[PDB]
Design a protein around this ligand. Structure first.
Ligand code: CLA
Ligand code: CLA
Ligand code: CLA
Ligand code: CLA
Ligand code: CLA
Ligand code: CLA
Ligand code: CLA
Ligand code: CLA
Ligand SMILES: CC1=C(/C=C/C(C)=C/C=C/C(C)=C/C=C/C=C(C)/C=C/C=C(C)/C=C/C2=C(C)CCCC2(C)C)C(C)(C)CCC1
Ligand SMILES: CC1=C(/C=C/C(C)=C/C=C/C(C)=C/C=C/C=C(C)/C=C/C=C(C)/C=C/C2=C(C)CCCC2(C)C)C(C)(C)CCC1
Ligand SMILES: CCCCCCCCCCCCO[C@@H]1O[C@H](CO)[C@@H](O[C@H]2O[C@H](CO)[C@@H](O)[C@H](O)[C@H]2O)[C@H](O)[C@H]1O
Lengths: 80, 98, 733, 40, 29, 63, 153, 150, 48
């Protein structure tokens, strides 16, 4: 299972969550940004590692980071 | 034609005299500042039991502390110089500069 | 971990074929294994070194045994200029009768291979004469291999494991290696040369059963302990001496003659013995520098800490470097690899110009093979030195403990370094290629007198400083009344000058405009390869495109398609790119060496002098001209003994082409295709009864780069090895 | 008129005009001073 | 004498035994 | 709180694309619970074609 | 002479090359009428070759044992026309180009969208800048002393 | 297409094209060597690539000298394409980062920020140069051979 | 039908049979066993 982490440079525009192809990320309440919401990754066991969230990250540097880790049948996108 | 025994004895004597009366203070004050260490502690303190210094070997009753290791080092230098003299005098090398 | 690999639990749970491929590829990366400790790391490395030594001894024992069993050493030592050395026999059931006839060479009774490693000359020079000598050498080497394995097993046991603190005692290891491994070994070798090899060259047969009864010198250790060492140099071998016999044989054991032996065209054995004695003395003296147990010596930490310039231009100087070097195995490996790669090229450059083995110099194929072999090994080692230096920056570098020392300032001005290397490489490439194309265009238009031919005057002046008189410079050793020539007038200058001014050996070959361009091509290749490797090492921890690169490791595929694209961004990818440039550079230097020597051995250097100034000359007069015999190894009219090299030529071409597949096509195309094959197997009758246990997947992104690079390198090596050996063996120069 | 002058100031058009002038100059120099290996 | 026996052993039999053993090892668990 | 709006500021964040560069302060958030209140606009676009970023109060130097 | 080379006015290989080139050119002359245009064109090539070889003789070039001119670069005062003077002229032209480029890049830096003057060039501004490279060494030196050449970051 | 045109060239030069004398005897360009030599890869390497390239490599100093120059140029472009095909833009953007520093040090950094070529664009450049070099190599080799010997 | 016995028997017996057959091959079956029948060719420059 890959590792997905969120840092507090988040501005909470929810761009990563709607770019997830496997529903790994979601938005949770917060108080550290004007949007009062931060991203979370409670379902990294469904992560495939396509890094689509980082392509949607507006912050510099990235506020969502994907580290490729141990490979499972779910993480390799196998249907057979 | 050079006597090997005389040359070797004189060179060893001169080297020992220099090491005991001339260059002793510099050598001691320099070894005082150079002790091998790893990660801020000596090799023995790190756990290397084979790196312990031989306290019973370096001690001596010389008034300034001249020991057997100093004798070996300066005698080796004297022997090297003596054999250089003997090997450089026997040959008939002439650098023809003039 | 329940399955394979047992050292990586994460790989063990992989349900695909990737679990196998990666398990093989990470076996020796002990630092990344499960539950690894520093003590276990050091002990495992110590054990692995013994196994490597055992393999090295077994390989040499096998070579000696096969030479003694199936070779023609005894017939070769009686006609070294007319007997082809035999490596081993051939037993292939696939051979046809013409293949059996064509491969019966030397004086053998069946198919054999002709040795091009130069072991025959090396063993003949050092005193070995009979097959029994090789037989008893092989047994001793097998015994050594067994003892190395036994020691490797012993130091892995609980009561013989060495501690980490013992592995980190740099001073004692340096003292013992400088004085014992280098100094004492050289003294033993010159002892062997004095006792066995030198008598052997004068017809005296000295072995274990009689070496206590024969005096190496008539005076017998008298002059050594008296001081008149000159008595060991008074009567050297005459110029009419024949090697291996007593005709014109002297009694000297340590001389300073210089030059080559007139018959064998190699260095004098007495000069070699004197050289090794001097080197043994130097190393024995140097081995008494560091403090171990007796209160005298130096501390490397204090030496590095005290070398801080007071001006502050080097920052904190070398302070703290002892701990970074001592606690990082990658730093040590990089330093060792850089030094070893430098001296491998040094060996290659010195062995062809100053042959040390009897009757090697007029064995052209062996010389070419040895030079190419050692230069390619050096090229690979030098890339490894930078790869591990890059790994050190990621895994072992501690920025806080290296504050403002000479190692942090490199990361401070990495941009200035990389830009200047880029400028140098760009300048060299632009101007070398422009001059080559200009000369090509002049030759195409029928006006060879419009070429830009620059004389390599600096190197010609250096040659004249060594005593070469073909340019009329009259400088230093080329002069008669100077002090430099007067100093060595009666020691080594006569023989050295006679060898240098002899225009049929490889000692300071005459150079012209053709050498100037190829040397700058070599310089461009060197600069570009170092540019790639240094940029990879200095950007390993991060850059503007990937500020957190150190968080992903030395080898990762990418950072994805975002931020414009991040292909080949890891430090491993810089090494992968630089291997191609190393191969190209070494190919250039080997092409230069081979073409310059093959024309000199043929008696017409003017073919190289006029045709090396433009690239079509290289294509036509070197590659096309010298491939006529090789490609005719087998033809519709028959075959000859060159058929192996003809087959290997095309084999290397095929492997080189296969590597392009992995280097060009990438993973997704293959994964989407493998899915269809999985469906097809799952829907085929009488094949549904068979099921795979590991899910078939395409090769990984990093795995494919490694596989393609391996195929590229294997084809590159095999094609040129076949071409070089076949071209130098069809005509023998 | 203004727009056409703006278009003629675009990078490719200016580049081809400049390199054409340079090529013509070099060609004429080589036609009148051919085969120059040195600078007298 | 020896080559006619040794070449089939090293070229065919030993690789087959090693491949079988290694395959059974990697397919374990 | 924070640099005045419209001022010129040097960026001290190491991982930022405009590290050691100069940008212009647009707005500064006054909520004390906001971790990175200083909004900065730059002349050059980063690798993601973005010209604006938020920085903390200690990553910005008034110049 | 230098490095064992002989001057091309003395070397016989140079003259032999000149003779063989003319002979090669004269063999194709046999296939045309003596008054035809191809015959007039090959004659012009023959005169061009004769002039080339005579010039190479007069300029005082050194030729190797192959009959081809060889360049001397070390700095000999009688061979400055092969590397030193052409190199100085190249370094004057290249510095001119670089300085005109730098001045144009500086002149458009302070605008609203300065990337539009990099794809659509302000030709009058370039005309203003271009002729400042004639004195580029003086200005390049003078911004070195004051400190307007290097950005101190 | 390269294999098809090589087949056509060798077959026509070996079994169809040739000369005929006023006796009734036919002599082909390569003398019917296709049947016994085109069945091995070594045959293609030796009797077709090595044998028939002897024209384009000895065309210097003649009217066909432009084909050897194009031969070398096509080889160069084909080799040049492998830089684009074997690498990726992440290395090149990082390398450009250092050159941009050198330009900024001398105040010559352009406003149009230099970017490495896109992932798709690098593939296009590599394949275009590969195809151009490969096709031009055969163009020059075929034309030189068939003009000199045809 | 004993898979443990069958694997060992097949591998070992097949290896022994292969070695035995290779050791019993004659010169008619294998050219490598027949050996050379022609005088050897000389080297490029007189080497044997
Ligand atoms: C005098 C005592 C002594 C001696 C002889 C050695 C010898 C050795 N130690 Mg060692 N060691 C010592 C004391 C000593 N050690 C002490 C006191 C410590 C503790 C502080 C250690 C700690 C230690 C460690 C931790 C390791 C070693 C290792 C090794 C081996 C290095 C590999 C090798 O064979 O290189 C051979 C090197 C040479 C022959 C010299 C270099 C030759 C140059 C490069 C080439 C030039 C020669 C010539 C031109 C080429 C020949 C041409 C022709 C003959 C082919 C070597 C056998 C390593 C090893 O492999 O262990 C298994 C290792 O990992 N040692
Ligand atoms: C003294 C020399 C030395 C030592 C001790 C090491 C030790 C190490 N290196 Mg290293 N290296 C060296 C030299 C050395 N290297 C050199 C010279 C190079 C440049 C070529 C490299 C390049 C290099 C890279 C790029 C990497 C290492 C890595 C490593 C570590 C793990 C190695 C591993 O997993 O092996 C696994 C090795 C293999 C499975 C070998 C693959 C097979 C190769 C391609 C040979 C194929 C030959 C082919 C089949 C021939 C076909 C013949 C034909 C007729 C069929 C380990 C600490 C890795 C690491 O962990 O770094 C952090 C890593 O990424 N090294
Ligand atoms: C023959 C193939 C080839 C060639 C010519 C090059 C050339 C170059 N590589 Mg390279 N490379 C190659 C294959 C090749 N590579 C391969 C296969 C790999 C493995 C993937 C690499 C990997 C690699 C790396 C990793 C690096 C290079 C670098 C370089 C540059 C080094 C500087 C130099 O030599 O300046 C001389 C420049 C040239 C010779 C380029 C040709 C210029 C032409 C001839 C002039 C223009 C002609 C004409 C006016 C154009 C008209 C055409 C069109 C407009 C109609 C240079 C551009 C380094 C770099 O970028 O340094 C700056 C670098 O870091 N290369
Ligand atoms: C870096 C590589 C390089 C270099 C140094 C040269 C250098 C030269 N080439 Mg050359 N060439 C090259 C690459 C190169 N070329 C390439 C790649 C090709 C293939 C396209 C050619 C094709 C080529 C041809 C076909 C010819 C040359 C010629 C020449 C000579 C020209 C002399 C001349 O016109 O002076 C006069 C020019 C000047 C003085 C410049 C004046 C510039 C301005 C106007 C000055 C005014 C302001 C002050 C010169 C030695 C010619 C020659 O005669 O060779 C002997 C010639 O016929 N070259
Ligand atoms: C690493 C060293 C090495 C290498 C590369 C080779 C390579 C070779 N040996 Mg060999 N050999 C070696 C060491 C080596 N030998 C040693 C140390 C011995 C003494 C036990 C032998 C005894 C030996 C015999 C008796 C024969 C070969 C043969 C061969 C060839 C066919 C392969 C074969 O049947 O292997 C056989 C390998 C062994 C019998 C033992 C391998 C060595 C270690 C201990 C395992 C091949 C060229 C055969 C040959 O000449 O073919 C024509 C053959 O009949 N070898
Ligand atoms: C070192 C490796 C090696 C060795 C020693 C051989 C040896 C042989 N190969 Mg071979 N081969 C190899 C590698 C090897 N191959 C590889 C890698 C390939 C792939 C490219 C091939 C492809 C190949 C082909 C395509 C053919 C051969 C054939 C042959 C045989 C030719 C002799 C003959 O004419 O008698 C012919 C003798 C027979 C046909 C009778 C053989 C009866 C045997 C001895 C019975 C014993 C089998 C034994 C029970 C099974 C043991 C298996 C083991 C796992 C335990 C000979 C036995 C030819 C052949 O006929 O062999 C079948 C043949 O057509 N080989
Ligand atoms: C490779 C290093 C190198 C360098 C940097 C130089 C640099 C120089 N050489 Mg020089 N030279 C070299 C090697 C080198 N040389 C060698 C190896 C030789 C032996 C053939 C010469 C022989 C030589 C002569 C004969 C002359 C120069 C001259 C010069 C100067 C050119 C005139 C000038 O600019 O006026 C400042 C210049 C300082 C000329 C001069 O006047 O020097 C003072 C001059 O007449 N050189
Ligand atoms: C204003 C123009 C200009 C100036 C002053 C410089 C200056 C410099 N460049 Mg550079 N460069 C330029 C344009 C320029 N470049 C362009 C357009 C490119 C893209 C092709 C590059 C690509 C480039 C690379 C890849 C490298 C440099 C490097 C360098 C430095 C070393 C010199 C060198 O290698 O030159 C070589 C210069 C070139 C190869 C490109 C020259 C292109 C033409 C001649 C410039 C034309 C400018 C413009 C069109 C004219 C303005 C017209 C205006 C009046 C309207 C130096 C600071 C090197 C470096 O950083 O090391 C310190 C280095 O590695 N440059
Ligand atoms: C007690 C006393 C005393 C005395 C002392 C003494 C007398 C001492 C001595 C000492 C000594 C007496 C020492 C010695 C030493 C020596 C040595 C240490 C040596 C060494 C050697 C060597 C090292 C060698 C080397 C070599 C070789 C081996 C070979 C040849 C060459 C050479 C030389 C290199 C007195 C009176 C003062 C006072 C008090 C009491
Ligand atoms: C990356 C990295 C690394 C690596 C690096 C490298 C790899 C380097 C290389 C380097 C090199 C590779 C160097 C080289 C050098 C060389 C030299 C330094 C030489 C010298 C020489 C000399 C000095 C000589 C002189 C002389 C004499 C003595 C005699 C003759 C004459 C003359 C004068 C010439 C490390 C690991 C560290 C770590 C960090 C990172
Ligand atoms: C620290 C260890 C001890 C260091 C000091 C060791 C002794 C130093 C040299 C003392 C004098 C040695 O002097 C030298 O001795 C050797 C050894 O027998 C003699 O050697 C003599 O006997 C030996 C065998 O014993 C013969 O091989 C030799 O042919 C013969 O000459 C020399 O003839 C003599 O010149």
């Amino acid at each position: 299972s890959h590792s997905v982490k969120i840092y507090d440079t988040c501005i909470g525009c929810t761009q990563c969550v709607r770019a997830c192809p496997t529903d790994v990320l979601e938005m949770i309440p917060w108080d550290g940004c004007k949007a009062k919401q931060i991203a979370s990754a409670p379902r990294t066991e469904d992560c495939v590692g396509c890094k689509r969230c980082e392509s949607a990250c507006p912050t510099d540097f990235l506020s969502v980071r994907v580290y490729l880790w141990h490979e499972t049948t779910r993480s390799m996108g196998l249907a057979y | 034609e050079l006597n090997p025994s005389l040359v070797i004895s004189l060179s060893t004597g001169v080297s020992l005299f220099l090491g005991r009366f001339v260059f002793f203070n510099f050598q001691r004050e320099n070894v005082g500042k150079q002790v091998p260490s790893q990660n801020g502690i000596s090799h023995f303190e790190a756990g290397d039991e084979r790196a312990k210094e031989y306290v019973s070997l370096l001690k001596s009753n010389d008034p300034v502390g001249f020991n057997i290791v100093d004798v070996l080092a300066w005698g080796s230098i004297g022997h090297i110089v003596a054999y250089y003299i003997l090997a450089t005098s026997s040959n008939g090398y002439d650098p023809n500069f003039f | 971990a329940l399955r394979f690999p047992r050292f990586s639990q994460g790989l063990a749970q992989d349900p695909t074929t990737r679990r196998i491929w990666f398990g093989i590829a990470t076996a020796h990366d002990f630092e990344s294994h499960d539950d690894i400790t520093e003590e276990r790391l050091y002990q495992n490395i110590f054990a692995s070194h013994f196994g490597q030594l055992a393999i090295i001894f077994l390989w040499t024992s096998g070579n000696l045994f096969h030479v003694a069993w199936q070779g023609n050493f005894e017939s070769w030592v009686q006609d070294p200029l007319h007997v082809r050395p035999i490596a081993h026999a051939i037993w292939d059931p696939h051979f046809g009768q013409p293949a059996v006839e064509a491969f019966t060479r030397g004086g053998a009774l069946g198919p054999v291979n002709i040795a091009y490693s130069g072991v025959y000359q090396w063993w003949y020079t050092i005193g070995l004469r009979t097959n029994e000598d090789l037989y008893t050498g092989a047994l001793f080497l097998l015994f050594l291999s067994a003892i190395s394995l036994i020691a490797g097993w012993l130091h892995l046991q609980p009561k013989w494991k060495p501690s980490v603190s013992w592995f980190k005692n740099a001073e004692s290891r340096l003292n013992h290696h400088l004085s014992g491994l280098f100094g004492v070994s050289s003294l033993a070798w010159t002892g062997h040369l004095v006792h066995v090899a030198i008598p052997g060259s004068r017809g005296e047969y000295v072995r274990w059963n009689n070496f206590l009864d024969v005096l190496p010198h008539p005076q017998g250790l008298g002059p050594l302990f008296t001081g008149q060492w000159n008595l060991y140099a008074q009567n050297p071998d005459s110029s009419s001496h024949l090697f291996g016999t007593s005709q014109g044989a002297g009694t000297a054991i340590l001389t300073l003659l210089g030059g080559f032996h007139p018959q064998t065209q190699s260095l004098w054995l007495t000069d070699i013995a004197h050289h090794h004695l001097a080197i043994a003395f130097i190393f024995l003296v140097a081995g008494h520098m560091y403090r171990t147990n007796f209160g005298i010596g130096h501390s490397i930490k204090d030496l590095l800490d005290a070398h801080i310039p007071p001006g502050g231009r080097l920052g904190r100087g070398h302070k703290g470097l002892y701990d970074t070097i001592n606690n990082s195995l990658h730093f040590q490996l990089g330093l060792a690899l850089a030094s070893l790669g430098v001296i491998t090229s040094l060996v290659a450059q010195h062995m062809y110009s100053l042959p040390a083995y009897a009757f090697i110099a007029q064995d052209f194929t062996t010389q070419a093979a040895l030079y190419t072999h050692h230069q390619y090994i050096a090229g690979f080692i030098m890339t490894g030195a930078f790869a591990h230096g890059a790994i050190f920056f990621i895994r072992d570098y501690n920025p806080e403990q290296n504050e403002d020392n000479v190692l942090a300032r490199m990361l401070d001005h990495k941009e200035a370094i990389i830009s200047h290397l880029s400028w140098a490489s760009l300048f060299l490439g632009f101007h070398t290629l422009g001059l080559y194309v200009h000369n090509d265009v002049m030759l195409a238009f029928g006006t060879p007198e419009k070429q830009i031919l620059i004389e390599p005057i600096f190197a010609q002046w250096i040659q004249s400083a060594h005593g070469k008189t073909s340019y009329g410079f009259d400088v230093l050793l080329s002069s008669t009344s100077g002090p430099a020539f007067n100093a060595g007038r009666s020691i080594w200058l006569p023989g050295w000058l006679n060898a240098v001014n002899e225009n049929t050996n490889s000692l300071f070959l005459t150079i012209g405009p053709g050498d100037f361009l190829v040397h700058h091509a070599i310089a461009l290749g060197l600069h570009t390869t170092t540019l790639i490797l240094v940029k990879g090492a200095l950007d390993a921890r991060g850059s503007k495109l990937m500020p957190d690169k150190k968080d992903f490791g030395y080898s990762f595929p990418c950072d994805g398609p975002g931020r414009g694209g991040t292909c080949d961004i890891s430090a491993w990818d810089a090494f992968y790119l630089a291997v191609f440039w190393m191969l190209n550079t070494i190919g250039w230097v080997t092409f230069y060496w081979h073409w310059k020597h093959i024309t000199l051995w043929q008696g017409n250097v003017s073919q190289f002098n006029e045709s090396s100034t433009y690239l079509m000359g290289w294509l036509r007069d070197y590659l096309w001209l010298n491939s006529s015999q090789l490609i005719n190894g087998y033809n519709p009219f028959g075959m000859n003994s060159l058929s192996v090299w003809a087959w290997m030529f095309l084999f290397g071409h095929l492997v080189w082409a296969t590597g392009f597949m992995f280097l060009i096509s990438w993973r997704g195309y293959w994964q989407e295709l493998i899915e269809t094959l999985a469906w097809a197997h799952e829907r085929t009758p009488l094949a549904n009864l068979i099921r795979w246990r590991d899910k078939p997947v395409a090769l990984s992104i990093v795995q494919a780069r490694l596989v393609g690079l391996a195929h590229f390198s294997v084809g590159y090596i095999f094609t040129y090895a076949a071409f070089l050996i076949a071209s130098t063996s069809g005509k023998f120069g | 008129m203004r727009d056409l002058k703006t278009y003629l100031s675009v990078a490719p058009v200016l580049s081809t005009l400049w390199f054409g002038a340079l090529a013509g100059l070099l060609i004429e120099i080589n036609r009148f001073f051919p085969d120059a290996l040195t600078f007298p | 004498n020896l080559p006619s026996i040794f070449v089939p052993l090293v070229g065919l039999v030993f690789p087959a035994i090693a491949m079988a053993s290694l395959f059974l090892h990697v397919q374990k668990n | 709180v924070g640099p005045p709006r419209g001022s010129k500021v040097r960026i001290l964040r190491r991982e930022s694309y405009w590290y050691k560069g100069v940008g212009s302060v647009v707005t500064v958030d006054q909520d004390p619970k906001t971790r990175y209140p200083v909004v900065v606009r730059f002349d050059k676009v980063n690798y993601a074609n973005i010209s604006t970023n938020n920085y903390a109060l200690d990553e910005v130097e008034q110049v | 002479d230098i490095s064992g080379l002989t001057p091309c006015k003395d070397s016989k290989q140079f003259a032999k090359r000149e003779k063989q080139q003319i002979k090669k050119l004269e063999s194709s002359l046999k296939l045309y009428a003596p008054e035809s245009a191809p015959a007039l064109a090959l004659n012009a090539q023959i005169e061009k070759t004769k002039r080339r070889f005579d010039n190479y003789g007069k300029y005082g070039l050194l030729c190797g044992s192959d009959g081809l001119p060889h360049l001397i670069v070390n700095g000999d005062q009688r061979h400055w026309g092969e590397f030193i003077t052409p190199g100085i002229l190249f370094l004057y032209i290249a510095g001119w180009i670089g300085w005109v480029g730098r001045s144009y890049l500086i002149a458009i830096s302070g605008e609203k969208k300065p990337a539009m003057k990099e794809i659509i060039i302000d030709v009058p501004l370039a005309s203003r800048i271009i002729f400042r490279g004639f004195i580029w060494p003086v200005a390049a030196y003078r911004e070195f002393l004051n400190g307007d050449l290097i950005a101190k970051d | 297409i390269s294999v098809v045109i090589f087949h056509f060239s060798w077959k026509m030069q070996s079994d169809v094209w040739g000369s005929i004398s006023d006796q009734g005897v036919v002599t082909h360009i390569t003398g019917g060597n296709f049947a016994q030599s085109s069945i091995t890869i070594n045959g293609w390497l030796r009797d077709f690539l090595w044998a028939q390239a002897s024209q384009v490599i000895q065309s210097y100093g003649s009217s066909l000298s432009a084909y050897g120059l194009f031969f070398l140029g096509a080889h160069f472009v084909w080799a040049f394409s492998l830089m684009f095909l074997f690498s990726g833009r992440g290395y090149w953007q990082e390398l450009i980062e250092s050159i941009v520093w050198a330009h900024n040090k001398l105040k010559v950094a352009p406003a149009t920020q230099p970017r490495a070529l896109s992932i798709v664009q690098g593939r296009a450049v590599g394949v275009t140069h590969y195809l151009l070099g490969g096709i031009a190599t055969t163009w020059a080799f075929f034309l030189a051979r068939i003009i000199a010997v045809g | 039908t004993k898979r443990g016995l069958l694997l060992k028997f097949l591998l070992l017996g097949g290896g022994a049979t292969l070695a035995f057959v290779s050791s019993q091959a004659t010169g008619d079956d294998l050219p490598i066993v027949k050996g050379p029948q022609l005088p050897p060719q000389p080297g490029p420059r007189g080497k044997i």
